[PDB]
A paper describes a structure:
At-[name] comprises an N-terminal GIY-YIG nuclease domain (amino acid residues 1–183) and an extended C-terminal region (amino acid residues 184-368). Here, we elucidated the crystal structure of the At-[name] nuclease domain from [name], establishing it as a member of the [name]-lineage of the GIY-YIG superfamily with structural changes in DNA interacting regions. Unlike fungal [name], At-[name] exists as a catalytically active homodimer capable of generating two coordinated nicks during HJ resolution.
Crystals diffracted to a resolution of 1.7 Å. At-HIGLE1–183 superimposes with the nuclease domain of Cg-[name] with a root-mean square deviation (r.m.s.d.) of 0.8 Å. Compared to the nuclease domain of Cg-[name], At-HIGLE1–183 showed differences in the conformation of loops relevant to DNA substrate binding.
Author numbering: 27 to 179
Write the structure that this text describes.
């Protein structure tokens, strides 16, 4: 199981700030960012509580997921993403990070992969409706953390 994920902060001092990362265990990872586990969350610990908005999984290797993570975090450096990124009005906030990742899922670098977009709450799924449609073999679902965890094993 190799995933990239998106958080958003519910801290009033950082409200709406996002975090993008790579993980093999989303439940462990959100617990780390929120301090329920005391590892893995230097700096992000200060912006609690975080919500995990979504993750994308199905990458065939850790390396394939890490290539996607790096481009999502650095769309202006990525060869694959930069032309699409040159047309974006904003890179800030959940709405922009989701529009960007749906754009990425349509690029040749990733659009042949058998990927799933997992929203952890219906709260965020409408952003996908305002983003470019995904390649038709990809899956979009709303699945809470407690249910997806069994599929990560
Ligand atoms: Ca690692």
């Amino acid at each position: 199981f190799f995933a990239c994920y998106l958080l958003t902060s519910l801290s009033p001092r950082h409200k709406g700030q996002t975090y993008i990362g790579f993980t093999v265990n989303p439940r462990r990872r959100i617990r780390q960012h929120n301090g329920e586990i005391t590892s893995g969350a230097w700096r992000t610990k200060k912006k609690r509580p975080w919500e995990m908005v979504l993750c994308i999984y199905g990458f065939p290797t850790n390396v394939s997921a890490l290539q996607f993570e790096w481009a999502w975090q650095h769309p202006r450096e990525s060869v694959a993403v930069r032309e699409a990124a040159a047309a974006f009005k904003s890179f800030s906030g959940v709405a922009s990070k989701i529009k960007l990742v749906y754009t990425m899922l349509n690029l040749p670098a990733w659009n042949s992969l058998n990927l799933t977009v997992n929203y952890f709450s219906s709260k965020y799924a409408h952003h996908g409706g305002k983003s470019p449609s995904l390649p038709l073999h990809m899956k979009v679902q709303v699945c809470a953390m407690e249910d997806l965890q069994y599929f990560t094993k």
